[PDB]
Structure formats: C-alpha cells, structure tokens
Design a protein around this ligand. Structure first.
Ligand code: BCL
Ligand code: BCL
Ligand code: BCL
Ligand code: BCL
Ligand code: BCL
Ligand code: BCL
Ligand code: BCL
Ligand code: HEM
Ligand code: HEM
Ligand SMILES: CC(C)=CCC/C(C)=C/C=C/C(C)=C/C=C/C(C)=C/C=C/C=C(C)/C=C/C=C(C)/C=C/C1=C(C)C(=O)CCC1(C)C
Ligand SMILES: CC(C)=CCC\C(C)=C/C=C\C(C)=C\C=C\C(C)=C\C=C\C=C(C)\C=C\C=C(C)\C=C\C1=C(C)C(=O)CCC1(C)C
Lengths: 49, 315, 26, 35, 49, 38, 38, 49, 38, 49, 38
C-alpha cells in the first residue's frame, strides 16, 4: 500500500487505490456528461414547468 | 396444609398461581373490553330502505326540483286536468302523470323539470332549447316499456314483479352514466366490455368444446366475474360449480333472459346501425352493473305495480 | 335481574379467589 | 420468564391500541380526520 | 439480586428489577395519559350516551 | 439483563418507522387536510 | 458492542434509498406538481 | 462499563451506554420536532373538530 | 475495515445501473419529452 | 483506533471512523441539498396549501 | 487484487449483452423507426 496516502492506508490496498482512482475519474466524467445532458434536455423540453 | 409445596410454598411456584390468574383475567378483560367498545361506538347497520316505488333507491330529497317547478306543476294540474299531447303515457290523468314524473322520471334523474320542458307549459314539445332532452326522455320511456314487456315479463314471478324504470339505469344521474366503472374493473382488463356481439343463449359456452381454448375460457371468465360483481352473490348464485353447463339454479336462466335483454339494448338503442346517429344512450353500451349495482335486484328497479301501466311489464 | 346475577357471580368469583388464595398465600 | 410476560403484554397492548383506534376511526362516530 | 427486596428476590434478578421499575413507571405514566385521554374524549363526544 | 440493547433498538426503530408510515398513509388517504392536492 | 458500523451503514443507506424512491413515487403519482407532464 | 452509572451497570455495556445516549437525544429531538409539527398542523387544519 | 472495497463497488455500480434504467423508463413512459415517438 | 476520540473508541475502529466521517459529511451535504430542493419546490408549488 | 479480471470481463460482457438486447427490444417495440414493419 505504498501508493496510498497514509490517511487512507487503513482502508485502501495498493491495487484498490488505482481501481478507486479509475472509479472516481469515471464518476466525475459521467457527472459532467450527465450535467450536459440535463442542460440539453432542459433547453429542449423543461420537465418542471 | 398443602399437597403442592413446590407450588404453594415456594415463592416462585406460589407466584405462578397469581401470574396465571392475572394473565387469564387480563386476556378476558382484553377481549371483553374490545368487543364492548366496538359494539358501543359502531353504528347499527343502516336500516334497509323502504320506499314504496323502488327496491333500494330513494328520490325523496327532492331539493333538485325547484319551487317554481313544483308550483307551476300543481298549477298546471289545477288548470289543465287531463294531459295535453302525451305520446306515451296514454292511460294517466295529468295528476298521475305529474306524480309519476316527479317521483320516477325526475326522481330517477335527480333533475328539475326545466331539464326537459318549459315550466310555464309542460305540454309544449319544441318551444325551448331543452326539447331534445324531452324527445330523448320519451324515447327512453318507450325503451323502458319495451324492456319491461319483452324481457322482464319472461322472468318468473318468483324473482318478483320488479320493473325497469328511470332510476334503474340512471340511479340519480341524468347524464354521465358510466356502465363499467373502474370500481367493477378490479381484476378484469380495463378495456374489457361485455361481449354483446354473440348470440347469448349459447355465446359464452366453453365446456368440452374442443374448438376453443384458454383464450375463450378467459373471455368467458371475464364475463362471469362481471356478473359476479354486478350481483354480489358470487359465482354459485346461478351455477352448481360441479358442472357449469348445468341449469340447476334457475338464476342461470334469468341471466340468459338478461343477457338477451342487454344485447337487445345494445343493438336497438345503443347502436342501431351505428351509435353516432339514430341512437339513444350516447353510445354507452350496457352492463349488468349499470342497474344491478352489486345487488341481485337492481336498487332503482320499481316495485310491482308502481310504474305506469303503459310502461309496465304487462300493459 | 340479569345484571344483578352477573354482578353476583363475579363477586362470588372474586371472594372465593380472595379466600383460597389467602390460604395458598399463608 | 419476565421477558416473556413483557413481550406478550407489550404486543397485546400495541395490537389492542391499533385495533381500537381503527374501530373508532372507521365508526365515523367521533369527528376525527373528517368523519 | 442485591438491589431487589428480599420478598421478590426469588423472582427478580438484579438487572430485571431495574427494567421492571422502568416498565412499572411507564405503565403508570401511560395510565395517567390514558385517563386524561378518556376524560377528554368523553367531554368531546360521550360514547355511552 | 432481560433484553439485549441491540434488540430493543431494532424493535423500537422498526416500530417507529412502521407507525410513521402507517400514520402518514392514514392521514394522506383521509383527505382531511388538503395535502398533496386533497 | 451493540452495533457493527457496517450493519448500521447498510440499514441506513437502504432505508434512505427506499424512502427516497417511495416519496418520489408518491409525489409523482399524486399529480399535485407538474412534474413529468402531471 | 465504567462510563455507565452504577445504577445501570447491570444493564448497559460501556459502548451500549453511548449508543443509548445518542438514541435518547435523537428521541428527544424528534419529540420536539413532532410537537412543533403537530402544533403547526393544528393551526393549519384542526383534525379533532 | 468496515467495508470491502469490492462490495461497495458492486453495490454502487448495480444501484447506479438500476437507477439509470428506472429513470430512463419513467421518463420514456411519461410521454413528456417527444423522444422515440412519445 | 488511535485516530478515534477516546469517547468513541469503544465503538469505532480506526478505519470505521474515516468511513463514518465520509458518511456524516455526505449526509450533511445531502441535507443541505434536500433543504434547497424543498425550498425550491415550495416556491414553485406549495404542497400544504 | 480487489477484482479478478475474469469477473470484470464476465460482468461487463453480460451487462453489455443484456443492455443491447433491452435497447433493441425497446426501440423495436416503440414503433418509432419503421424497422421490421414498424
Ligand atoms: C375515545 C374513547 C373510546 C375508547 C378508545 C380507546 C383507545 C383509542 C384506546 C383505548 C384504550 C384503553 N381503553 Mg378504551 N375507549 C373507550 C371506552 C373504554 C372503556 C369504557 C367502558 O367505556 C374502558 C374501560 C376502556 C378501557 C381502556 C383500557 C383497555 C385502555 C386504556 C388503559 C390501558 O390499559 O392502557 C394504557 C396504555 C398504556 C399503559 C401504554 C403506555 C404506552 C406508552 C405511553 C407509550 C405510548 C406509545 C408512545 C407514543 C411510543 C413512544 C415511543 C417513543 C420511542 C418515545 N375504554 C371509548 C369507546 N380506548 C387504550 C389502549 O391502550 O388500549 C390498550 C387505547 O389505545
Ligand atoms: C424507545 C426505547 C429506547 C429508549 C429510550 C429512552 C428514553 C427516551 C429515555 C430513556 C432513559 C432511560 N433508559 Mg432507555 N431506551 C431504550 C433502551 C433501554 C434499555 C434496554 C433494555 O436496553 C434500558 C435498560 C434502558 C434504561 C434507561 C435508563 C438508562 C434511563 C432512565 C429510565 C427511567 O428511569 O425511567 C423512569 C421514567 C419514566 C418511566 C417516566 C414514564 C413516562 C411516561 C410515558 C409519561 C411520559 C409523559 C409525557 C412526556 C408527557 C406527554 C405530553 C405530550 C407532550 C402531550 N433503556 C430504547 C432503545 N430511554 C431516560 C433517560 O435516560 O434519561 C436521560 C429517557 O429519557
Ligand atoms: C397532522 C396531524 C395528524 C397526525 C399525523 C401524524 C403524523 C404524520 C405522524 C404522527 C406521529 C405521531 N403522532 Mg399523530 N397526528 C394527529 C393526531 C395525533 C394525536 C391526537 C390525539 O390528536 C396524538 C396523540 C398523536 C400522537 C402521535 C405520536 C404517536 C407520534 C409523534 C410523537 C412520536 O412518538 O413520535 C416521535 C417521532 C420520533 C421520535 C422519530 C424521530 C426520528 C428522527 C427525527 C428522524 C426522522 C426521520 C429523518 C428524516 C431521517 C433523517 C436521517 C438522515 C440520515 C439524517 N397524533 C393528527 C391526526 N401523527 C408521528 C410518528 O412518528 O408516528 C410514530 C408521525 O409520523
Ligand atoms: C444514518 C446514521 C449514520 C450516522 C450518521 C451520523 C450523523 C449525521 C452524525 C453522526 C454523529 C455521531 N455518530 Mg454516527 N451515524 C451512523 C453510525 C454510527 C454508529 C454505529 C453504531 O456504528 C455510531 C456509534 C455513531 C456514533 C456517532 C458519534 C461518533 C457522533 C455523535 C453523535 C451524538 O453525540 O449525538 C448527539 C446528538 C443528537 C442525538 C441530536 C439529535 C438530533 C435530533 C434528530 C434533532 C435534529 C434537529 C434537526 C437537525 C432540525 C430539523 C430542522 C429541519 C431543517 C426543518 N454513528 C450511521 C451510519 N452520525 C454526529 C457527528 O459526528 O458529529 C460530527 C452527526 O453529525
Ligand atoms: C417536492 C416536495 C414534496 C416532497 C418530496 C420529497 C422528495 C422527492 C424527497 C423528499 C425527501 C425527504 N423529505 Mg419530503 N417532500 C415534501 C414534504 C416534506 C415534508 C413536510 C411536512 O412538508 C417533510 C418533513 C419532508 C421530509 C423529507 C425528509 C424525509 C427527506 C429529505 C431529508 C432526508 O432525510 O433525506 C436527505 C437525503 C440524503 C441525506 C441523501 C443524500 C444522498 C447523496 C446526496 C446522494 C444523492 C444521490 C446521488 C445522485 C447519487 C450520486 C452518486 C454518484 C456515484 C456520484 N418532506 C413535499 C410533499 N421529499 C427526500 C428523501 O431523501 O427521502 C429520504 C426525497 O427523495
Ligand atoms: C431528461 C431529464 C429528465 C431526467 C432523466 C434522467 C435520465 C434519463 C437519467 C437521469 C439521471 C440522473 N438524474 Mg435525472 N432527469 C430529470 C430530472 C432530474 C432532477 C431534477 C430535480 O429535476 C434531478 C436532481 C435529477 C438527478 C439525476 C441523478 C440521479 C442522475 C444523474 C447524475 C447521477 O448521479 O448519475 C451520473 C451517472 C454516472 C456517473 C454514470 C457514468 C457511467 C459512465 C459514463 C458509463 C456510461 C455508460 C456507458 C455508455 C457505457 C460505456 C461502456 C463501454 C464499455 C465503453 N434528474 C428530468 C426529468 N435523469 C441519470 C442516471 O444515471 O441515473 C442514475 C440518467 O440515467
Ligand atoms: C437507433 C437509435 C436508437 C438507439 C438504439 C440503440 C441500439 C439498437 C443499441 C444502442 C446501444 C447503445 N446506445 Mg442507443 N440508441 C438511441 C439513443 C441513444 C442515446 C441518446 C441520448 O440519444 C444514447 C446516449 C445512446 C447510448 C448507447 C450506448 C448505451 C450504446 C452504444 C455504445 C455502447 O456502449 O455500446 C457499444 C457496444 C459495444 C462495445 C459491443 C461491441 C461488441 C462487438 C462489436 C461484437 C458485436 C456483436 C458481434 C455481432 C458478435 C460477433 C461475434 C462473432 C463470433 C465474430 N443511445 C436511439 C434511440 N442504442 C447499443 C448497445 O450496445 O447497447 C449496449 C445497441 O445495442
Ligand atoms: C325513464 C323512462 C328514463 C328516462 C326519462 C330517461 C331519460 C334520459 C335522458 C333525458 C337522457 C339524456 C341525459 C343527458 O343529459 O344526456 C338519458 C340518457 C341515458 N339513458 Fe335514459 N332514461 C330513462 C330510462 C333509462 C333506462 C331504463 C336506461 C337503462 C337501460 C337508460 C340508459 C341511459 C343511458 C346509458 C344514457 C346515456 C347517458 C349518457 O352518458 O349521456 N335510461 N336518459
Ligand atoms: C363464477 C365466477 C362463474 C364461473 C366460474 C362461471 C363459469 C361459467 C362457465 C364455464 C360457463 C359456460 C358453461 C357452458 O358450457 O354452458 C358459464 C356460462 C354461463 N354463466 Fe357463468 N360462471 C360464473 C358466474 C356466473 C354468474 C354469477 C352468473 C349469473 C348471474 C352466470 C351465468 C351464466 C350463464 C347464463 C351462462 C350461460 C351463458 C351462455 O352463453 O350460454 N355465471 N359460466
Ligand atoms: C406518504 C409519505 C410522504 C410518507 C413519508 C413520511 C415518512 C415516514 C418519511 C420517512 C423518512 C425517513 C424515515 C427517512 C430516512 C432517511 C434515511 C435513513 C436516510 C439515509 C441516509 C443514508 C445515507 C446518506 C448513507 C450514505 C452512505 C454512504 C455515503 C456510503 C459511503 C461509503 C461507504 C459506506 C463505504 O463502504 C466506503 C465509503 C463510501 C463513501 C463509499
Ligand atoms: C392509525 C392510527 C390513528 C394509529 C394511532 C396510533 C397508534 C395505534 C399507536 C401510536 C403510536 C405508537 C405505537 C408509536 C410508536 C413509536 C415508536 C416506537 C417510536 C420509535 C422511535 C425510535 C427512534 C427515534 C429510534 C432511533 C434510533 C436511532 C437514532 C438509532 C441510532 C443508531 C443506532 C441505534 C445504532 O445502533 C448506531 C447507529 C445510530 C447511532 C444511528
């Protein structure tokens, strides 16, 4: 677990930290895409009305 | 002086007697006090309606009739004593015609006379914007007479002498009459309607046919559960469930007469060569629920001898 | 006379219970 | 066992309270929750 | 069973006595509240009539 | 002790949640309040 | 220890998700707000 | 069970006492909120009438 | 360690997929958007 | 359990404390977002009326 | 390692196949395209 910050060493393995980084970046990219999709769908047809 | 020293001397055993006693009286007090509360606060089941004209329908909160209309009515009777230009209702004095029109005709629709004619002149046919409603009502009276003489007569007297009248199908609503409401479509498909297309003395027959399968049995079961809801008495009301093809119960024969009658309603009045034109009842195909409403005898059905003779099952 | 009798029999039940439970609880 | 008596009494009381509330509310006798 | 009175020592443990005290006080409070509720409901709508 | 603390916690929390749901549903269905278009 | 932290986390998270779904459903079916053509 | 008062030592563990304190404070807060909610709903629409 | 990382990953991914499917189906059935002839 | 305050040491592991901190901060953020959402939905369409 | 590569492959492939089938069936049943006799 040398790659893990010592704050998260009790929780994250060395390999689990890299997979967690991938998951975090994927969640962030998906969030940006979801925000863009929501803005586009609102400009198209507002659902709240 | 005891024989159960482990039960009457020792505190643990001695306590068990009190424990059992207290638990028995606690359970008894539980049950008794619950049933006491339930029976004292619960109202008595409402007394069954006793109206002279109807089975279990009442018109008598007659607030729906204006005072101007009841005033003009008795004035009209006072001046005009025999009816003027009745086309149905042939054998009735304007007083009896008027009493019937308030008790049954408007009492069945729960509407004022201004719903169908001008209150100044009950006799004028086409002098007001609501004349179309009066011609519709006259055609409905003809329809009622036809249904009474051509389908209610064939039912035995053991059923009763009940006759179809306005409140039988309207039940206090002039328009917006909905056969097949969502209440009675509980486990049926909501799109399902009674299959009045078929020739009914043998239209839903399914047993041992070998040219039908579970799809026709499913249609049959939809129709049969519709009859179950329309007359709350369930499935053995007209069947010996050990053999459904059997006519043991004799309510199955009454139901054949009634199926023929509702098929006749649909073919003659709902959609005579199309419902859009030349057809009364606004394209509302009938159902057993439309007048039975969860009873074997329709609540709005008139008691024997209450409808006019012209509309009666025997004229 | 039914309410009288039900009250009578419940109090006889209770007094019987006090008596023999008094003996058992002696 | 005291735990058994506690469980039984508490469950009986809760069931009784629910039953009596439901009987009283369905009776339409008291003017509670638009009755 | 040290805290239990010697009358009830054959029946009550040391811990069962405290829980019994809680149960008794809860039953008493609930009874007072039930009496108040019954008096209020009677003043509102008498059920015996 | 007569009762594990975890058991009492589970029972009380579940009873409270069930009762909150039941009372909310009874009050909503009563139509007595004009809440959620009533 | 009365309660494993993992157990409390699972129970609380599942209760919150179930309640969010239930409340969303109830609010959407009520037709009391113009959400999703209502 | 040191943190527990000796009255409740037969019943409460050391950890169970802290969780019981949290439960008690949560119940009290919920009770205050419930009283406020009931007063507001009564001022809005009285259910007893 | 209260929670295996694999368990949290499985649960979160399955919850996200189920929620995406549910929301897509609710939005498509609502007919509020004119998507896929709605 | 060093990172845990000694008050909560009987209850929280070293790793469980960090995950608890994440859960608490997530609950607080979700609460703020829920309050904002409720204020917005009230300004839009009051449900109590 | 937290996640066997074979497990991730099985899960991803099955999810992709299920989603392709689901989306194809939703699109074909929608009648929005005029594909396979609308
Ligand atoms: C409105 C008047 C109605 C009626 C409606 C009710 C209702 C409603 C109830 C009763 C209940 C009872 N009624 Mg009654 N009752 C009526 C007429 C009668 C008559 C009579 C001959 O007229 C009698 C003798 C009774 C007799 C009784 C007792 C059986 C009982 C009240 C005392 C009791 O033992 O429980 C005392 C109760 C307790 C000791 C429980 C204490 C519980 C504590 C206080 C917790 C309460 C729950 C609390 C909210 C939870 C909070 C937990 C949080 C974590 C902090 N009723 C009339 C018809 N009656 C009550 C009952 O409980 O039934 C068992 C009840 O539910
Ligand atoms: C839902 C049950 C919750 C719980 C909720 C509470 C609450 C809440 C409290 C306690 C408190 C106590 N609990 Mg605890 N407690 C739980 C589980 C337990 C267990 C268990 C078996 O493990 C035990 C042994 C205990 C033991 C105890 C003692 C540590 C302590 C003192 C009680 C006492 O003396 O009562 C004696 C007192 C009574 C019995 C009074 C009875 C009250 C009746 C109902 C009347 C109430 C009047 C009402 C407030 C007025 C209503 C008016 C309306 C506003 C209109 N709890 C469960 C999880 N516990 C008390 C505390 O710690 O004090 C800080 C307290 O505040
Ligand atoms: C609008 C008025 C309606 C009515 C509607 C309701 C509704 C709705 C409710 C009650 C509930 C209750 N009502 Mg009521 N009630 C009415 C009339 C009455 C009358 C009376 C004779 O008139 C009485 C005595 C009561 C009595 C009561 C109690 C049984 C209870 C409130 C205190 C309680 O014990 O729980 C106190 C509650 C708590 C201690 C729980 C605390 C929970 C904490 C705060 C968490 C809350 C959930 C939170 C959002 C989760 C966040 C987690 C995140 C991770 C951070 N109601 C009228 C008819 N009543 C409430 C109840 O809970 O039922 C059990 C409730 O749900
Ligand atoms: C959903 C449950 C979550 C959780 C969510 C939280 C949250 C959220 C918090 C804690 C916090 C605490 N939790 Mg935790 N906690 C969890 C699991 C646990 C477990 C477990 C068995 O493993 C334990 C032992 C703990 C223990 C603790 C202590 C470490 C800490 C202090 C609590 C306290 O003193 O309460 C005493 C205080 C109270 C009991 C107040 C009661 C509040 C009532 C409900 C009133 C609320 C008023 C409300 C805010 C106003 C409403 C107004 C509306 C806006 C209109 N948690 C689970 C996973 N935990 C607190 C923290 O760490 O502080 C940084 C806190 O903020
Ligand atoms: C529109 C107004 C509607 C209504 C619709 C809703 C809806 C819709 C919801 C609630 C929910 C709640 N409402 Mg409400 N609500 C109304 C009226 C009320 C009233 C009142 C008496 O009037 C009250 C007291 C409440 C009370 C509440 C609480 C029970 C809860 C909000 C706080 C909470 O505990 O969860 C706080 C929530 C959190 C702490 C969760 C935090 C989760 C984090 C932020 C993740 C969110 C999911 C995220 C997208 C996932 C991303 C993961 C990616 C991997 C990154 N509502 C009116 C009728 N209410 C909300 C709820 O959650 O129910 C449990 C909710 O779903
Ligand atoms: C059109 C507008 C509709 C609507 C339709 C949808 C739809 C449709 C969706 C959401 C979803 C969401 N909406 Mg919405 N939504 C609306 C109104 C709202 C409102 C609001 C009060 O108005 C809110 C708060 C939300 C909130 C949300 C969040 C719950 C979520 C988006 C962020 C998220 O957490 O997931 C963020 C998502 C990710 C982090 C996943 C990232 C996945 C990566 C990018 C892979 C994607 C799959 C990819 C194709 C696979 C490729 C693999 C190959 C091997 C390479 N919606 C209106 C009614 N909403 C989205 C969701 O995911 O639900 C969970 C979604 O599916
Ligand atoms: C016609 C347009 C329809 C529609 C119909 C479909 C259909 C149909 C499909 C999708 C699928 C998808 N669509 Mg779509 N889609 C539409 C609108 C959208 C919109 C948008 C908001 O408008 C979005 C974002 C998407 C998004 C997506 C992604 C979820 C996905 C395509 C990329 C993917 O991840 O899988 C990429 C796919 C791969 C990486 C798999 C690669 C497999 C290899 C090539 C093998 C293929 C099988 C092969 C024949 C086997 C040969 C083996 C022999 C042994 C050699 N669609 C409109 C409504 N959509 C596709 C999907 O796969 O769903 C998961 C699909 O099936
Ligand atoms: C009794 C003799 C009788 C009268 C009178 C009557 C009148 C009547 C009117 C005036 C309408 C139209 C109401 C309107 O505002 O549109 C109307 C319509 C329907 N009726 Fe009728 N009707 C009488 C008797 C009966 C009986 C016995 C039946 C049942 C077979 C019946 C049925 C119907 C139906 C169905 C309609 C259509 C209701 C609609 O939705 O508009 N009527 N009737
Ligand atoms: C109970 C829900 C119910 C069942 C089940 C049921 C079955 C059933 C079958 C199988 C038939 C066809 C039998 C055949 O081969 O002759 C059938 C036919 C009729 N039923 Fe029926 N039926 C059930 C309920 C009811 C009820 C409540 C009635 C009467 C109100 C009723 C009546 C009839 C009549 C009449 C027929 C003959 C129809 C035909 O076209 O000949 N059924 N049922
Ligand atoms: C008719 C009507 C309207 C009725 C309604 C009336 C009623 C009764 C309403 C009821 C309301 C109630 C009871 C609401 C309850 C809400 C709760 C419990 C929310 C839970 C939140 C839990 C949360 C946010 C949990 C979050 C979990 C997180 C962040 C997990 C974190 C994580 C875990 C645990 C790990 O592994 C590792 C770290 C990581 C961050 C990944
Ligand atoms: C329909 C009609 C008219 C009905 C009439 C009415 C009737 C019939 C009865 C009325 C009322 C009744 C019976 C009410 C019951 C109320 C109860 C039981 C509330 C419980 C609250 C429990 C509560 C607040 C529990 C809180 C628990 C908490 C905060 C948990 C905390 C935790 C626990 C326990 C852990 O481990 C560690 C995690 C954490 C610290 C979060």
């Amino acid at each position: 677990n040398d790659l893990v910050p010592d704050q998260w060493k009790p929780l994250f393995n060395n390999a689990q930290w890299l997979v967690h980084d991938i998951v975090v970046k994927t969640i962030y990219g998906g969030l940006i895409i979801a925000v863009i999709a929501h803005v586009l769908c609102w400009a198209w047809t507002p659902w709240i009305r | 002086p005891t024989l159960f020293p482990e039960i009457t001397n020792t505190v643990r055993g001695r306590f068990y007697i009190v424990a059992g006693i207290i638990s028995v009286v606690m359970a008894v007090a539980s049950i008794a006090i619950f049933w006491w509360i339930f029976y004292t606060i619960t109202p008595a089941p409402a007394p069954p309606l006793q109206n002279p004209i109807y089975v279990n329908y009442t018109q008598e909160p007659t607030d729906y009739i204006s005072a101007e209309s009841l005033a003009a009515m008795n004035a009209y009777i006072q001046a005009n004593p025999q009816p003027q230009a009745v086309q149905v209702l042939k054998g009735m004095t304007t007083a009896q015609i008027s009493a019937y029109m308030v008790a049954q005709v408007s009492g069945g629709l729960k509407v004022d006379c201004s719903y169908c004619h001008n209150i100044a002149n009950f006799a004028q046919q086409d002098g007001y914007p609501n004349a179309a409603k009066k011609v519709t009502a006259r055609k409905m009276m003809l329809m009622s007479a036809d249904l009474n003489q051509n389908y209610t007569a064939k039912l035995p007297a053991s059923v009763g002498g009940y006759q179809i009248t306005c409140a039988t199908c309207h039940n206090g609503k002039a328009a917006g009459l909905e056969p097949y409401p969502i209440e009675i479509m509980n486990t049926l498909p909501n799109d399902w309607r009674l299959p009045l297309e078929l020739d009914y003395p043998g239209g839903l027959v399914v047993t041992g046919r070998k040219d039908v399968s579970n799809h026709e049995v499913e249609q049959n079961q939809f129709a049969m559960y519709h009859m179950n809801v329309s007359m709350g008495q369930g499935c053995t009301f007209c069947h010996n469930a050990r053999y459904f093809p059997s006519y043991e119960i004799a309510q199955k024969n009454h139901s054949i007469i009634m199926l023929q009658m509702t098929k006749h309603i649909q073919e003659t009045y709902v959609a005579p060569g199309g419902r859009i034109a030349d057809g009364i009842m606004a394209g509302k195909s009938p159902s057993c629920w439309l007048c039975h409403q969860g009873a074997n005898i329709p609540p709005g059905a008139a008691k024997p001898g209450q409808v006019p003779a012209v509309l009666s099952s025997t004229p | 006379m039914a309410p009288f009798l039900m009250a009578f029999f419940t109090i006889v039940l209770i007094v019987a219970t006090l008596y023999f439970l008094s003996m058992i609880m002696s | 066992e005291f735990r058994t008596s506690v469980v039984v009494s508490t469950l009986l009381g809760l069931v009784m309270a629910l039953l009596i509330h439901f009987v009283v509310l369905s009776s339409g006798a008291f003017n509670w929750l638009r009755a």
